[PDB]
Amino acid sequence: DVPTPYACYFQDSATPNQEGILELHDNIMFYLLVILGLVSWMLYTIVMTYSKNPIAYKYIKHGQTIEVIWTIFPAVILLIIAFPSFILLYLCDEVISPAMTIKAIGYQWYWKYEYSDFINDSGETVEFESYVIPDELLEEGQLRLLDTDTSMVVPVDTHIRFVVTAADVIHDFAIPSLGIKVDATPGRLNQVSALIQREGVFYGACSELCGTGHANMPIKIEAVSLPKFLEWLNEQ
Amino acid sequence: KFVEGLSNNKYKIITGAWAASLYGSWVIVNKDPIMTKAQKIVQARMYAQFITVGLLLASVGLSMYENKLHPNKQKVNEMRRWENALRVAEEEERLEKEG
Amino acid sequence: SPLHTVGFDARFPQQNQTKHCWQSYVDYHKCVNMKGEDFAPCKVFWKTYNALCPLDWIEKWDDQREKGIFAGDINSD
Amino acid sequence: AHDEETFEEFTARYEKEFDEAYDLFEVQRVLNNCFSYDLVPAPAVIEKALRAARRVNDLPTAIRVFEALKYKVENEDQYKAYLDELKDVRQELGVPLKEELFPS
Amino acid sequence: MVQRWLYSTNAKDIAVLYFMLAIFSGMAGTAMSLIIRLELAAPGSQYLHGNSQLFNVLVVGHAVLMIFFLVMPALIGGFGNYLLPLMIGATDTAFPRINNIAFWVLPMGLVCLVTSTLVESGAGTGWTVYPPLSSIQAHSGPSVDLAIFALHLTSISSLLGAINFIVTTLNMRTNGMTMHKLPLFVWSIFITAFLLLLSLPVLSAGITMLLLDRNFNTSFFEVSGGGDPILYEHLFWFFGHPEVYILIIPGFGIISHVVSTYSKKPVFGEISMVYAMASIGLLGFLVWSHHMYIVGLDADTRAYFTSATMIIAIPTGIKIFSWLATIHGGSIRLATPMLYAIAFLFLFTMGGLTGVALANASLDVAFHDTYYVVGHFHYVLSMGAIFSLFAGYYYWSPQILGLNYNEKLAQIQFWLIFIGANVIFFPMHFLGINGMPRRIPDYPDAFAGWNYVASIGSFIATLSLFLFIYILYDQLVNGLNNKVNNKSVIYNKAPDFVESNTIFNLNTVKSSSIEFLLTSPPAVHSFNTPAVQS
Amino acid sequence: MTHLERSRHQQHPFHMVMPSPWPIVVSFALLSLALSTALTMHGYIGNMNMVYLALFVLLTSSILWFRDIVAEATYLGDHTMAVRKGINLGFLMFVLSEVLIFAGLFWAYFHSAMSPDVTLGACWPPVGIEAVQPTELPLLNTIILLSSGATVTYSHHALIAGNRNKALSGLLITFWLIVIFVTCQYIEYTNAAFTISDGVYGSVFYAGTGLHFLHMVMLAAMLGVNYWRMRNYHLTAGHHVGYETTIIYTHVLDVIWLFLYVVFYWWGV
Amino acid sequence: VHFKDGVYENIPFKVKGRKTPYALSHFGFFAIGFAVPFVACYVQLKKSGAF
Amino acid sequence: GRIGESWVITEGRRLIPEIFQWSAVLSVCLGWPGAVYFFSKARKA
Amino acid sequence: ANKVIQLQKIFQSSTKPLWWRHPRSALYLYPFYAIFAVAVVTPLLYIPNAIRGIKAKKA
Ligand code: HEA
Ligand code: HEA
Ligand code: CUA
Ligand SMILES: [Cu+2]
Ligand SMILES: [Mg+2]
What we know:
This is part of a larger assembly, with 9 protein chains of 9 kinds. Chain A is α+β, with helices and mostly antiparallel strands. Chain A is built from 3 helices and 10 strands. Chain A folds into 2 domains: 77 residues, Helix Hairpins (Orthogonal Bundle); 136 residues, Sandwich (Immunoglobulin-like). The interface between A and E is large, with 88 and 88 residues.
């Protein structure tokens, strides 16, 4: 969810998409570390046993057997690597039957979230601009530069598909915990799906250049249970 | 009655005929074994573009040969799409009410 | 309990949805200008554009419709 | 010829290439081209190399044959069972080895 | 002397000037890298107080200056201009005034790029200068216009050098060079000069479309008005991937030559290696949108591009396997360009493996505009092209300059840049997979350790370049004394085992290309007569 | 012949160019042009007088460079057959680079045309913009290029043959033919319903046709230079590489005009 | 005219016969090269804030 | 080979001491982030 | 007007450089040197006026 000092792994799982991305990255790294180990072992063995070699086998310049095996081995490993990424790419675009929708339109150096599925029985759509808390009005426990005074809040255990766009410079809606990253270009709406499997906060940042206020542009998504979300949406 | 399907693809037939025209002009002109490669290429290109822009007006005559058979297009295909867009709304909300 | 929305349209399954909002908006203004001036099950289109595309786009297109400089004209007489 | 060379064609080709050399550059050149192949040559090659180094009348290339061979072989049992096969040529030609010449 | 350095249509005295602007601009770009990584060392507003626009200006200056004014000159311009006529036996290149105007329109691109960072605070977009971030509404001023006029001038320089190289190795070869007998660096400069004139026209068209919708009121990417900014991403990255393949292919040529000559062995299957390099060249156009997996392409075209970037990945693999095969079984003489050649293999295999981790269009949604990407390209660009650049200089400059360097200082320079650059870009992977975005002035203070470790490394990587500057000085004022007084290495190819010293002094240089047979600093008319070959 | 009067020559066919001061001057002028047109686009200098003189000094330095190359090619006499094949292949690769700029412009047209945005009315051409019909003036200035190609190819094949009165007549009438093309193209520009700012359609349309417009006015300057040095007896019967260069250029300009014309005037309306 | 060749007639620097030491020119070249981004930072830090 | 110490033993003797130093140089060419994390205050130092 | 061999006999037989070897080449290069020096030194006095930010006096 949130980053940790001196960490060397992913911000952990919330969505089936992020679980699939974590499993796929570990499978790809498991297939890559064999190649890295044998490349480093070949380099070490060669440069520490042929440096103290006084003659050079200069009459070895081609061999077809070992040439075609080292050109057919990376094709095999790359087919095995590309075999599950097709499954993830073709399932992470499957947005059949979501529950509710969000718009996450990003202006210059803030976001503006809006819900308009009409169960708020005041009648209207609900919007809020979601400015960063400036870093002198922090009050004794608040995470620096990625906190927000007005969070987005989503429910648990419903598929939510949110579209995203801008009104200016190309932004990016990017949370690494939910595995969601999509460029908010000002011309088109871009939709991505989510199924958040546990309550709690999730932090993210803008991951496209916006100009001066690129760092002062965070995303804070609290995921609460469905009755508390219904109460919040009716009250707000 | 074939004008519908092979006049929907005008600018595929024109481009394929241009490529085949340059090929069938080049294989004719290169059989003369006296000239430079460049003169053969530019003569083949000239013959090809002449027959291609000559066919571009034949397709205009064919285009109004299609236009009498289908009057005032681009605007009544839009309303066929609109009828298929209204049926998909009524079929859906009637089962939303009784489902 | 309920949280229903537009579901999944078969015409626009891609990642972009700008044509989906623009077509739903122009077809709302094509239903309620043509068959009957307001009484319908073409509130589906209203639900769809008001769910999908943002308020600045809706305000810009409605002021363009008022001034008459709308892009895809809505069969108005 | 990029087709492979069998051992008999190897030793016949190189014996007829050690017989023809006349200068010192030629003997050291064909000795380097014989040793920088993959196999170690049979002593039918190397006693002819010793004779071809005797024909040019210089000593240390009739010693570096033996040290290059000690670098060539896989252990020292092969080296000892090799060196007792070139005993009398080393005797009547009078060349030394390295380990007895430079004791260290 | 004015007609020998200002008019100077001779391809030997243009390459020295190329190298002088290369070392000047590389010093400026690494000053910018030092300032960036010095400001990012700790959370909270460091040395430049506030002022994120200045940091954006500094990072676009570092990126575009060190790409288009150090690596592309000191690999294409300098090394091709000095060596491509000197390996195929041309007396010097065809169209000589064309590669004089290429050099002389480089530093005016440099001076307009320098004065672009002073007027109206400045162009900050990053080197991939995007709309509507750079259109006149969100970025006003004459700054980014001068910043892309620099790209127009550098684009013109590299294309003129490309046409020059292509014709001068398609016609003026020597007597016996057939269509496949050239040394592999000639083939690298060949294929790179093809990719230049097949790629950068699209770049210059896209960025002049950016200029005339900035100032001439057109609407190519101004979206309220018809256009779309996705068309710039297409039109830019159609050059943007062939640009780095252009920057890395002469690196492959240099590394092939130095591992061929420092292991006393020919390269394992030179014909298959040049087929792999040429297929990498003709295949590097078909994968241009692996930098655009996020913007909203379909899953079908994303599936195509994540299929095709792995077939991009395979011939680089067979090239690295042939490099391991040609250093296997050798007689490896560990001098200072051979050390850089050995380090390049490991430090580029590492970046290529994390590159194919990036190449999955599935996996790019967790890694885009994130310091994992910086860890990948600051491996395969930095360590790749510049370890090949150092293995070009430390291997060729005793022949070109005619002054032998110091050897122990060269080895402490190699180990200092190796350690002090491996400590920078390795924590960038942990910063990436923990969630740090790119181009931030600084960050939420969770990941406060790896930035400090990278900043304590960048000072080592700068001190090694200061020692490289002292290596240049010690080579320039103590060349003959390093020839005589036993501080250097003199013979790069050692005598073989059974060869005497009196026999090594007959055949001193056992080369396979022409360049190590010309005398130190070579004559201005080297090939009076052609250089025959069978 | 004698060795003594064989070693008094070049010993290889390739060109050895004396040090000439026209990379440095035209590079100076290119820098001044770039900075002055980056400086006057924002109102820092008052008028366009300085970008005018910068463009003029670039033009006159490059025409002095071409003066130096025609003097070296036909007076000092170094362009032998190896150097001739070299400069021929160099011009072929330069024009292969120009057609890729044209391909980038066609990529822009196709990408914004076959997927039209929702602010254009979702139809190509957009709403309200009266598109140019392809059959009135486009038909004249697409048949005039074919007639220009036919007369420049018979002027070429009369130059190889030996007659002067035919090989000069073809060059004169192809010069006046394509300048009649350029003038009626300007006539087409000065009464058209959309400008370069009116939407994306006018933008990419005027970008493509204006780049072809500037390319053929540069071709007309090239052909005027070639007619001058054909009248002044520079062009021979077997050493006309600077004329084969421009006929290759005008034939590829004709075919890229027909591509531009078809997909800019028939499919795009 | 073929320009005459030597060990120090291939570079624009004159090294052996001078009046000033070579270290002055050789380190001032990279001094101005290393100090052009510092003067860019100074002219950008006096235009907006302080310094 | 045929006569001598066997090739399995005479190449195991050459390569088995090489595996441990390869593991050392790889564990200190990729494992120094562990050594810099070990002394910092995040490990309650 | 068939004046190519006289120009060749002049151009081969001189010591002056190529861009100064013609008879009428004094009228082509002195005004060029003047206008080129003016046209390239003139934006380098307008660049500090742009660095200071002071625009023109137009309208
Ligand atoms: C040429 C490519 C290149 C190289 C070598 C480098 C090397 C360095 N770079 Fe980077 N960098 C980029 C190109 C490069 N960079 C690009 C394209 C971006 C993206 C910008 C964006 O997207 O916004 C970027 C971004 C970038 C970031 C990420 C910032 C961010 O976007 O958030 C950082 C942070 O550390 C950085 C700093 C450094 C430092 C300290 C080095 C150090 O390694 C520098 C030390 C290097 C040397 C010491 C090399 C030797 C120098 C010589 C001059 C040798 C001379 C020899 C010869 C001429 C033969 N640059
Ligand atoms: C020098 C130019 C250069 C080179 C050569 C590469 C090499 C590669 N790169 Fe990289 N890359 C960049 C320049 C380059 N890159 C730049 C400039 C960016 C940042 C752009 C920005 O600003 O956004 C970037 C970032 C980047 C992205 C964009 C991600 C993003 O921004 O969202 C991608 C996407 O696919 C990528 C992938 C690859 C791959 C697969 C290779 C391959 O070519 C690597 C090939 C090497 C190997 C594969 C290893 C050796 C092979 C073996 C050991 C055999 C076994 C291997 C296998 C079986 C796989 N890198
Ligand atoms: Cu919004 Cu960065
Ligand atoms: Cu790429
Ligand atoms: Mg991006």
